[PDB]
Design a protein around this ligand. Sequence first.
Ligand SMILES: C[C@@H]1CCO[C@H]2Cn3cc(C(=O)NCc4ccc(F)cc4F)c(=O)c(O)c3C(=O)N12
Ligand SMILES: [Cl-]
Ligand SMILES: [Mg+2]
Ligand SMILES: [Mg+2]
Ligand SMILES: [Zn+2]
Ligand SMILES: [Zn+2]
Ligand SMILES: [Zn+2]
Lengths: 252, 270, 69, 47, 48
Amino acid sequence: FLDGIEKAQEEHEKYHNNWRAMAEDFQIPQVVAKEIVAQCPKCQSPKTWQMDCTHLEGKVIIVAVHVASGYIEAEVLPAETGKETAHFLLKLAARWPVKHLHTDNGDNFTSSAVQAVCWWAQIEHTFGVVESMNHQLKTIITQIRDQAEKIETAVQMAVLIHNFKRKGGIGGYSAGERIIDIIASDLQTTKLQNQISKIQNFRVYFREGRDQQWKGPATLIWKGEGAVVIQDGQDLKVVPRRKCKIIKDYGR
Amino acid sequence: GFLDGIEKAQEEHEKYHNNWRAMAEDFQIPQVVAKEIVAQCPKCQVKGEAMHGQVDASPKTWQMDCTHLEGKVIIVAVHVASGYIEAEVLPAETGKETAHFLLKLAARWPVKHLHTDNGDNFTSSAVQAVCWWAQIEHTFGVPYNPQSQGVVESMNHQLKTIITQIRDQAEKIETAVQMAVLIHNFKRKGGIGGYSAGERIIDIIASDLQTTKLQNQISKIQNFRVYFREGRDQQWKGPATLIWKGEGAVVIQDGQDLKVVPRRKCKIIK
Amino acid sequence: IIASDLQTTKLQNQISKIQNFRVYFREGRDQQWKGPATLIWKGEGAVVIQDGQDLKVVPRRKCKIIKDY
Amino acid sequence: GFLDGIEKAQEEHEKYHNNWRAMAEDFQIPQVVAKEIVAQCPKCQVK
Amino acid sequence: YSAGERIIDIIASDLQTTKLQNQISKIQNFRVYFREGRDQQWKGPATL
DNA sequence: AACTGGTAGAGATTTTTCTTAGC
DNA sequence: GCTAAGAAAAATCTCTACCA
DNA sequence: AACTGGTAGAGATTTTTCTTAGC
DNA sequence: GCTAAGAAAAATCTCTACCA
Ligand SMILES: C[C@@H]1CCO[C@H]2Cn3cc(C(=O)NCc4ccc(F)cc4F)c(=O)c(O)c3C(=O)N12
Ligand SMILES: [Cl-]
Ligand SMILES: [Mg+2]
Ligand SMILES: [Mg+2]
Ligand SMILES: [Zn+2]
Ligand SMILES: [Zn+2]
Ligand SMILES: [Zn+2]
């Protein structure tokens, strides 16, 4: 265990690994490897979307693309005013976690209805991939046009073919597997951060071997069944539980 | 004896329709004969059997229903294993808008099984053509039995309570419907893992994909064939793949069926 | 000739005592109780009954299955 | 049901004087009514 | 076989062995909520 | 400050009773 | 003569629909 | 022959945690 | 210094209305 912590610290000193790889290799828990990463001085987006509009056969299409995976949601608007763009933004924010929106300096994107929707849904709007996605979507639309009667059915069938039937990239996945994996990784990071702060609200007085004095207040990191990992003086050490006293610390 | 009691009890039930305890007490016949006298009557036998079933909860099953609110028509679709809600306001209750809503939902999320009631819009050629083109298995419930689609009617109740909570913050009803969908999906926690509905659908689909890839990489390099002895008769069956060897029992795969065999009735051959 | 008739009657008695059931079900909009039918398939939750050369699916909560002694 | 079985078992014991286990296996009536059919005959004794 | 096919085959076999021994515990680190017969509550987190 | 859900039947499971083989 | 296995029969417990 | 009730909140009761008096 | 009483706070179990 302590040999695992020493090997992990030497391995991060050489190669600067990440905490998932160290937790899998050296068989240490995740909070300890995250603290090893958090102590390195040389080591210190999944919710950004881009929106645009286009024209196709006299219809006004609006396209929203998740940037980090290439995930497309499209719709056919009856006009190009601000209320319909605000309604499309409200549906998009109600289905996926949207935290940062990037648009161009158009008329309908600079409107009081879109600003009210961004205020109620807590989205940061920023004015300046989407043109390449519009080009690829129009190629698919002209490829499967003869199987539909209206234009909305062709738009939604092209969205389905782009999202789940086209595979590429490094691992050979589509866009839906990429966006689900990215958001799941971010969720794991936030849950681990909550556990880290809740554990680190404590304090430990420990007694060394062949001594009867209590030592300085070291910060608790991991409280096991028989072992306790503490940080003191930029050093991690493992003390057994029968030589330690854990108190609360109100030191904000 | 009680044979004349049996004849008099049959005539008494023919006139008065007693239950079995009255005949067994008044005519001193045993209870099996009185239960048979009651059980061979057609004017009786009006009662169920007092049990409930359990609906399908596969990771790609969706359920759909329609509801009314303030003179509008809402259409609700729910992902069953997580509780994830998509809802829209329709201008009419025909089959074309239902096929369009189903096509948008199938273009966003992976759908492989759809469950509905027997309404006039769900049983239509447009919905059948969309299900054929998108390869969806469409199943219908037993008619006039709303308990088969329990999840979507429960979510109808939850959606209506949220809409009454946030009604004064919106002008139209479509804005209030979309705000209620956002409040349900991301602002309410509690359930299986303490998650909301969006975190739970992300966790379910990502875990399914990761466990399929992991067991493909495991099972492509396996060995250790196992011959087992089971059944009512002590026979011997063909070659099966060993999966997991544990203290007490072994897990085998035979004919794409998983079985758990005790360690005494199996033999491992490399 | 006689012994094979004994074996045939024993096997026919076992096959006849396998699945001689009657079902009183409740279906429709006005949920009234209807006459006897023949049970075909019995799964956990619903049953399939043959009535008047019509196949119907009734849940087990809306039907009563009478066996034989 | 087995009520017609009880009637036919009474006729069969009136003719041939069977025992109770034979009538219970042949006519598919329970054992209590078969023992009562044997008991109400003055010449037979259930054993 | 040439030399390149032999070195690729040898390294792939050894890596398959070691990563199999790790991936068994990786697939046993999941949690399952299941349902039994005639009870309407979801049972606790058994191991897959 | 002084009011309120209940009844009966269908199966499943546990207990009691009755006949008979074996030492 | 006495005892235990085994099966039939009676007793108890849990759960559902309907009452404007 | 291949179908099926469920979701979320209010209290009551049991378990865990945190501070302090007493030997 | 160590231990037990006591009270606050978090976790679990049972039960109800509503969904055309
Ligand atoms: C014309 C379509 C097809 C034929 O049936 C009708 C009537 N119906 C009735 C209810 C209903 O009574 N819901 C309340 C409810 C009551 C008890 C329960 F357990 C669950 C519940 F939801 C529906 O929900 C519903 O969707 C329909 C419906 O769609 N139709
Ligand atoms: Cl229906
Ligand atoms: Mg409906
Ligand atoms: Mg409904
Ligand atoms: Zn570093
Ligand atoms: Zn009657
Ligand atoms: Zn006689």
